[PDB]
Design a protein around this ligand. Structure first.
Ligand code: NI
Ligand code: NI
Ligand code: NI
Ligand code: NI
Lengths: 836, 836
C-alpha cells in the first residue's frame, strides 16, 4: 500500500466517523467528538468521489447533522469542522462553518458511503452552555488619561494602506497625508490589535492618543526615532519634508484628552461582550467551568484597557510598539503568555505571564515601557521573546498526582495529556508488588527508574517500601534516591513498622504515606493513630475503599498530624459506584460471593455511608488532596476531572459554601484546585518549585478552553516549553484540521524533557550526588520541610472535625452532625466529551 | 485479548480493506492503494474461514477485482499482492500474481465477510502508464573487445551444477569436463548476473570471454589463483590434474574476439527492453516520472555492457568476481548503490554510487579492477561493502525544505517519509508566535530545539526573530545558534527593521528571510525594496498569498539581489485553489465576510492573477525555490509533489521549454529539481554539504520507483545509512507482505541520527563551540557565503524579468508581456496514490 503517516491517520479518522455513523443510524444523539468525526469523515468521502468542489462541501457540511441528531451542547461547542483530502486537483482544505444549522440533517448525506440504513427522524428522542462568559451589559473606555487629537487622513496612494492600533502614526506610509506634527508621539485610539483601512483616495477622520510610559518612538521609517520632546519633533518634521512624507497642516483639528466620560468625543468604547471575545474576560465577568455548574469570577485584572498585548498581523507585539527596543537583551522574557485567566488557589485573576529560564518570571502587565504605562522591568517583551496567546483561555498550574503506582509507562502519557506535570509514587513496572503498592523497593530499581524516566518531561518522585520494623534497609533506599516511603498493609502496616518508619522520616525529612491495616489484625484505627505518636503522616485513600481499618479509617480526617488524601474512583458517590467497587474488590482479591467470610470482608471495606461522607469531607476541606491510585484502584487521567465532578455535585446538592459569595463559586473553586496543585507539593516537600502559578516557581502550566475546562486541555507547558498539545493533521496547511489529538511536542524529544524537569530525591541522596552517580540529565532537588506539617498547613483544606463512625451501621458524623449526601445519577465532564 | 504487534497491524490492514469494500460497493473505481488493501484483507479473511489452501487463494485473489472496478493505471501498477495469515496449519504467505486479470471481478468474493450488498456491474462508469520505460527497438552487444572461445562442457556429476556470469570458469566444480586450459582467465559471455545450468550428463556449448582490468584470478577452488600469465597457467593445469578436476583437450574449439558485429558468433546480445528490466534503462532510453507527462532521458551511462554490478545468488558481487581481493581494506566502499538512474540538476545519468564515511565517495563504474575495465580506485567493492540495489530505480538528493514552521514534531516524520532530509525554519512548538512565523526567538529555545532534535536523522537549521530595529538582541540569538533570521510582518516588517536586520546579516554571514508588510502600513513594495539597499535577501512566498505587500509583492522576482521562493499551497493554480485560500485566510485571521473592510483585505491578498503568474514565473526560472510553510499555510509532505505538479501543468499548457529538446523534458526536469535541492542549500549557505548528488557531499539520498516518483519514495538514506523505508509485516517471511508502510529504520534509534546528520549554525555560534555547550551529538557546521549572492547564483532559476502589477486589476506582466495560465481541473501525483 505504501501508506504515508497521514494516510494511516486519516484511516483512523474515518473509523471514528463510521462509529459515529453507526450510532446515528440507531438514533443516538451524537456528542461533540462524534459530530466532528462524522462531518470530517464525510467531507473526505465526498472528496474521494470527485464530483464536489471545496465551495460545495462548505455548504453540504452544514446539512449533515441537525440539532435533533446531536446533544444540546453541541451547537454551542461546534463552531467549525476542518479536514484536508485528496480532490481530483490535489490536497485541499475544507472548513465547514457552524455545521449544526438546521433542526434535522439530511441523513442520507450524513450516512453517504457507509451503506448503513437511513433512520427515520422520529428515532431521535428529546440548556447549559459549556464555558460561557457572563458579563454586565456595559461598555469600557479605552486609553483614559491621555492627550488626544482628531485628524483628517487622506490616501494619495494607488494601493490599500492599513494601520495598526499601536503603530507610531508619524511613521506611516508616505502616501498618507495628514498633520504629521500633530501625529508626533501619537497612535490610533482603537481597540488593541485592530486597524484602520485606507483605500486609494479615501479621506477618513481618526482619533489619536499619546503614547505613554517613557514616550520613546522606535522603528517604522525612522522618521521620528527617539524620546518624545521638542528637539526630536523638529528633527522629525525636517525628515518628513526631506523624504517626502505626506504632510498638510490642520490648524483647527480638535484637541483634548481621554477620560471616564461617555460623552467625550475623543473616547473609544468597547462592550464587555466584544472585549471578552478579543482579550478574554475582565474584572467582574464570570466563566462557566466546562459543562459544570461552577462559575469563576475575575477578581482583578492587571490590564490597562487599550494596551493589551495581542500578537498577529497589524497587532500590538511588533518592533518598537508592544515589542521593546529600550532594554538590555538579558532582560527580555523568553516567553510571554498574553491575556491569561489564571485559576489558582491564590486567586482567580486576569494577567500576562512572563517566563524566563523555565521559571515564572512575572505575573502582571507585560509589554514595552517605552509606549505603555505599568510595565515593570521583569515583564518586557523583546525581539528574543516568544508569544503564547492566552486570550479567551484559562491557565492553571500543572496538576500533581501524589498516589502513582508506576505499573506501566503508558499511564505517564495519559497523565500529562490530561494536564498532570508531576508524579509521586512508587513502582518498578507491572510486578505484583507495584500492582499492589506504591513501592520502589530496591536501590537497583531506584537507580533504574530514575534513569528510565530521565528524558520524560514530568517531575518525578519515587517512594520506597517503608514497611519494616528496623531502620537499616530504609536508610539505604532513601540514600539511593527515595523521596518518601510507603507503609502498606500488603507488606505489613503494623504499629511496630509504623513507628520505625516515622522515626526514619524524622531523621531524613521525608514524607510517609500510609495504607493502614484493613483487617484490624494488629489493632484498630485508634492503635495506628497511637503509633503515629503525633508525627506528620500522609494518609492515602482516607475514606478506605482503597484500603484501611474497616470500617472507620476515615476518622483520620480529624487528626491534626494527619494530611489526608482521597483517591479518585470513589469521587463522587454516583449510582454505579457501589456495584462497581464491590465487584472490583472481589475480583482483585479473589473473594468468593458464595463464601460468607469473603462477602463479609468485602462489605466491611466498600461502604456507601463512608463514600458519601467523603464527598462532604472534601467539600468542607477536611480532606486536603485528590490523587489517582493509577491502575491499582484509580484512574491516572481523571485526577482533575474527578475533583471538579465532586465540587459540581456538592454545589448541586448543598448550594454555595459558607465562605462563598452569592455571585460566584470562587472559594469552592480555590479550595478544590488546591487539592491537586499546592497541597500535594506541600505534603511531599517541594512546594517552592511547583504546585501554583506564582513567581519563582517552574513554569509548569496548562492552557484550557473554558468549554473544555477540567476534561481536555489545549496545551501542557513544562518548564516553559510546550511538552504536549492538541495538534491536527501533520501534513495540513494549518494546525487544526482533523484528526485533532493530544500529541507529544518538542519537549519530549532528545534530552529536552530532562532540561525542563526535576527529579525529587531525599537530602541523603542529594548529599551523595545521586544524579552524578546515575548519570541523570534531569535536574535533581531534595525534598524538605515535611516533618513539622499539620492539617493546618493544607491550603484551604485545613478542617479538623471530630469524626465518629458507628461500628455496626457505618453512620459517619462530624462534630456530632450527620454527614450524608444522595447518590448522583449523572456527572458533568463526561458524556459531552468522550468517544467511549 | 493479548494482542501482539502484528495483530494490531493486521487489524489496521483489515480496516483499510473494509474502506475499500464500502467504496467498491457504491461503484467507486478503486485506486492502487485501495486495491492492495482489499485483496490482502480478503486473503486474510479466507484464511480465517479455513476452507481454502494457499494454492486456492493464489487463484481466488485473481478473481476479486476486474479492470472495470479499478482505475486505468491499476492493472499496470499492480504486479502482485502479498499477505500472511493464520491458516489451520499456521502462518502462511500468499502471493496473488497479476490480480487484475479480468474485465469484471467476482464481486461476491471481493465483498466476502463484509456483509455489504453486492453492487450490479453497471455501477462502474467509464491511457497513461506510470513510470513507463521507452526504448528503441534494438539490441545491445555485451563484453566487446575481448578474447573469446566456444567450449563443449559436459557434466559427469549426479546432481545439478549452475555457473554464474562472472565466475572464473577454470574454478568450476570438478565434475564438469571441458578444456580447462582454454578456460583459463575466461568467464561466461552471458548477461551479467545470469547463469548456465548443467543437469547430470548434459553437454552444452558455452561462449567464454576474457576477464579484463588487471586480469587476476582469485577465490573459487584456488586452482588458478594469481595474475593471468604463462607461469600461472602451467601452475593451474598442474593443479587441475593433481586434484582431479575434469579436463579434456578441445583442440579445434573456435577462438576469436567479441566486437560490434551482429554476425559474430562469439557475441551475446540483449534487447533494450530486457536490459532495462534487469539493470534499469541506459543511454537514450526515457522514463515517465510517476503519472505525470514528464519524460526523463538518460544522457549518459558509465556502465560497460556486460560488467554490471548486480548482487544475488550466482550474480556479480561475489568473492574474487565483482567483489575485489586486490585492494587495501581502507579503500573498500562502505556501501555501493548499484545501477542507479540519477536525476539531479547537474544531469540525468546512469551510474553506480559509492558511499564512504557517510559521504558520496564516487559516481561512475563500480566493481573489481582485477576482472573489470574502468573501475577507479574510489569505486572498489570489497568484503566490507554493503549493497543497495538501484537497478530499475531513480536516485535523487534528499529534498531541502527551507520554510519550516517547527509547530510539532510530527511534521518532521511526515517530511522525511516524503523524501525530505534537511529542514530550515524556526519555531518552539505550537506557540502562537511559531504558528505564525518561522522564529525561534529566545537563546533558551535555540538551545532546547537543538537538543530536542539531536537524535533525529535530518539536518536542521533554526532561524531567530529578525524583526528588530536594534542589533543587540539579534547578535545574541545568532551566537546562541541561529543560522538565519526571519523578518515577519506579525513582528513588524518595517523599513527600519529590514535595514537593521540586513546590517546584522552582513556582519554574520547568514541569510535573511522575509515576509513583507501586506498592509502597506509603513510603505509599498518599492519602499521595502529600497530598504534592502541592494543587499542579498530571501523572499518567502514571493507570490504573496502566504503574505506580503498587497497586491504586488511578486515584483521582487525581478530584483537582482532577491532570492525568491514559493510556498506550496498555491502550486499550481487549480479549480479549487481560490475558494480554498480565501476561506483559509478569513478563518485564520478571524475576518468577517459581512464586514466590507475585512473582505476587501482578503480579496487584496488572495488573487487568481498573481497565482497564475506564479505558475509561469516558476516555469521560466524567475522563482528559484519551492518550500512548504508547514502548518502555517503549507503542507510539509508536498514540497516534492507540488514541484512536479507545477512542471506537469506547465508542460500541458505551454509545451516544452525553449531550452528543452524535442525528445524529452530534461531541461524542465533539471530546472524544477533545483528548486527543492541545490537552491535552498545555496540560499542558506550550506551547499558544500548537501543539495545535490555530487562527490564529497553527504550521502543524503532518496530511492524512487519510477511509477511512484514524486509521491512516495522507497527508501530514504541519511548520511549513508537507511533512515526511513517502506517495510511490510515485521513478522513476515519476507519484507514485502502487507501492510507496507513508510517506517523509521535503524538510523532513527539510539543516537544514530546525530551521527548521520548536521545541525547548521552561524559562524558566531560555532566560534563558541555551541555543540559542546549544549552537549549535542549531531555534527555542527557553520553556514557561509550568503552575502554576495544574487538571482544569478540560483541554479537554472536565474531569470530576472521586469515585473509589473496593475494596482486595480492585478494583471501581471513580465517584460511587458502578459503572464497568464488557465486553472487546471486535475493534477497528477494525487488520485492514483492516496487513500484519502
Ligand atoms: Ni492503598
Ligand atoms: Ni495505591
Ligand atoms: Ni509568511
Ligand atoms: Ni511561513
Amino acid at each position: 500500500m505504501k501508506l504515508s503517516p497521514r494516510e494511516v491517520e486519516k484511516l483512523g479518522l474515518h473509523n471514528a466517523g463510521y462509529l459515529a455513523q453507526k450510532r446515528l443510524a440507531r438514533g443516538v444523539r451524537l456528542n461533540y467528538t462524534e459530530a466532528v468525526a462524522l462531518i470530517a469523515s464525510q467531507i473526505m468521502e465526498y472528496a474521494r468521489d470527485g464530483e464536489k468542489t471545496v465551495a460545495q462541501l462548505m455548504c453540504l457540511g452544514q446539512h449533515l447533522l441537525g440539532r435533533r441528531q446531536v446533544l444540546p451542547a453541541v451547537p454551542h461547542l461546534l463552531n467549525a469542522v476542518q479536514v484536508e483530502a485528496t480532490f481530483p486537483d490535489g490536497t485541499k482544505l475544507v472548513t465547514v462553518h457552524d455545521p449544526i444549522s438546521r433542526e434535522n440533517g439530511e441523513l442520507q448525506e450524513a450516512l453517504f458511503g457507509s451503506l448503513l440504513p437511513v433512520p427515520s427522524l422520529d428515532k431521535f428522542a428529546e440548556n447549559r452552555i459549556p464555558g460561557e462568559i457572563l458579563c454586565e451589559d456595559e461598555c469600557l473606555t479605552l486609553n483614559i488619561g491621555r492627550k488626544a487629537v482628531i485628524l483628517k487622513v487622506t490616501s494619495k496612494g494607488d494601493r490599500p494602506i492599513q494601520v495598526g492600533s499601536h503603530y507610531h502614526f508619524i511613521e506611516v506610509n508616505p502616501y498618507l497625508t495628514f498633520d504629521r506634527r500633530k501625529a508626533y508621539g501619537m497612535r490610533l485610539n482603537i481597540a488593541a490589535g485592530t486597524a484602520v483601512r485606507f483605500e486609494p483616495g479615501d479621506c477618513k477622520s481618526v482619533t489619536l492618543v499619546s503614547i505613554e510610559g517613557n514616550k520613546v518612538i522606535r522603528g517604522g521609517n525612522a522618521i521620528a526615532d527617539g524620546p518624545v520632546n521638542e528637539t526630536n519633533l523638529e528633527a522629525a518634521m525636517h525628515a518628513v519634508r526631506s523624504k517626502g512624507f505626506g504632510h498638510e497642516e490642520e490648524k483647527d483639528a480638535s484637541e483634548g484628552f481621554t477620560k471616564e466620560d461617555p460623552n467625550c468625543p475623543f473616547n473609544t468604547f468597547i462592550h464587555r461582550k466584544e472585549y471578552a471575545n478579543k482579550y478574554g474576560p475582565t474584572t467582574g465577568d464570570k466563566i462557566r467551568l466546562g459543562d459544570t455548574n461552577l462559575l469563576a469570577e475575575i477578581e482583578k485584572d492587571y490590564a490597562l484597557y487599550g494596551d493589551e498585548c495581542v500578537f498577529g498581523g497589524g497587532k500590538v507585539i511588533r518592533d518598537g510598539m508592544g515589542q521593546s527596543c529600550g532594554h538590555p537583551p538579558a532582560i527580555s522574557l523568553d516567553t510571554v503568555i498574553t491575556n491569561a485567566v489564571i485559576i489558582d488557589y491564590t486567586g482567580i485573576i486576569k494577567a500576562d505571564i512572563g517566563i524566563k529560564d523555565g521559571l515564572i518570571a512575572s505575573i502582571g502587565k507585560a509589554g514595552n515601557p517605552d509606549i505603555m504605562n505599568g510595565v515593570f522591568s521583569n515583564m518586557i517583551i523583546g525581539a528574543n521573546t516568544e508569544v503564547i496567546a492566552g486570550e479567551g483561555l484559562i491557565v492553571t498550574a500543572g496538576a500533581i498526582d501524589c498516589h502513582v503506582h508506576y505499573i506501566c509507562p503508558q499511564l505517564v502519557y495519559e497523565a500529562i495529556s490530561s494536564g498532570i506535570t508531576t508524579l509521586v509514587g512508587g513502582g518498578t513496572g507491572p510486578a505484583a508488588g507495584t500492582r499492589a503498592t506504591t513501592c520502589t523497593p530496591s536501590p537497583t530499581q531506584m537507580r533504574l527508574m530514575l534513569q528510565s524516566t530521565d528524558d520524560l518531561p514530568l517531575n518525578f518522585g519515587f517512594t520506597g517500601k517503608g514497611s519494616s520494623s528496623k531502620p537499616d534497609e530504609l536508610h539505604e533506599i532513601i540514600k539511593a534516591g527515595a523521596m518518601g516511603l510507603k507503609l502498606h498493609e500488603d507488606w505489613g502496616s503494623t504499629p511496630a513498622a509504623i513507628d520505625n518508619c516515622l522515626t526514619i522520616a524524622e531523621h531524613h525529612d521525608i514524607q510517609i504515606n500510609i495504607h493502614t491495616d484493613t483487617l484490624n489484625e494488629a489493632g484498630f484505627v485508634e492503635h495506628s493513630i497511637a503509633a503515629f505518636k503525633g508525627r506528620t503522616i500522609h494518609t492515602y485513600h482516607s475514606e478506605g475503599a482503597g484500603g484501611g481499618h474497616a470500617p472507620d479509617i476515615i476518622k483520620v480526617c480529624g487528626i491534626k498530624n494527619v494530611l489526608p488524601s482521597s483517591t479518585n474512583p470513589t469521587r463522587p458517590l454516583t449510582s454505579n459506584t457501589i456495584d462497581e467497587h464491590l465487584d472490583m474488590l472481589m475480583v482483585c482479591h479473589h473473594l468468593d460471593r458464595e463464601i460468607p467470610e469473603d462477602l463479609a470482608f468485602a462489605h466491611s471495606r466498600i461502604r456507601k455511608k463512608t463514600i458519601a461522607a467523603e464527598d462532604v469531607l472534601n467539600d468542607i476541606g477536611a480532606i486536603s488532596i485528590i490523587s489517582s491510585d493509577s491502575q491499582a484502584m484509580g484512574r491516572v487521567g481523571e485526577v482533575i476531572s474527578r475533583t471538579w465532578q465532586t465540587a459540581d455535585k456538592m454545589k448541586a446538592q448543598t448550594g454555595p459554601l459558607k465562605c462563598d459569595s452569592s455571585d460566584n463559586d470562587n472559594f469552592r473553586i480555590r479550595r478544590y484546585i488546591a487539592k491537586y496543585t499546592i497541597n500535594p507539593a506541600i505534603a511531599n516537600g517541594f512546594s517552592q518549585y511547583v504546585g501554583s502559578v506564582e513567581v519563582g516557581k517552574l513554569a509548569d502550566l496548562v492552557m484550557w478552553k473554558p468549554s473544555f475546562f477540567g476534561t481536555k486541555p489545549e496545551m501542557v507547558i513544562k518548564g516553559g516549553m510546550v511538552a504536549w498539545a492538541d495538534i491536527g493533521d501533520p501534513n495540513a496547511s494549518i494546525p487544526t484540521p482533523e484528526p485533532v489529538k493530544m500529541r507529544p511536542m518538542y519537549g519530549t524529544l532528545g534530552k529536552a524533557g530532562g532540561a525542563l524537569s526535576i527529579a525529587f530525591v531525599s537530602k541523603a541522596a542529594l548529599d551523595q550526588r545521586v544524579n552524578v552517580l546515575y548519570g541523570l540529565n534531569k535536574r535533581v532537588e531534595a525534598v524538605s520541610n515535611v516533618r513539622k506539617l499539620t492539617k493546618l498547613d493544607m491550603k484551604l483544606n485545613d478542617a479538623l472535625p471530630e469524626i465518629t463512625v458507628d461500628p455496626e451501621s457505618y453512620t459517619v458524623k462530624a462534630d456530632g452532625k450527620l454527614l450524608c449526601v444522595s447518590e448522583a445519577t449523572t456527572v458533568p465532564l463526561s458524556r459531552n466529551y468522550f468517544l467511549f
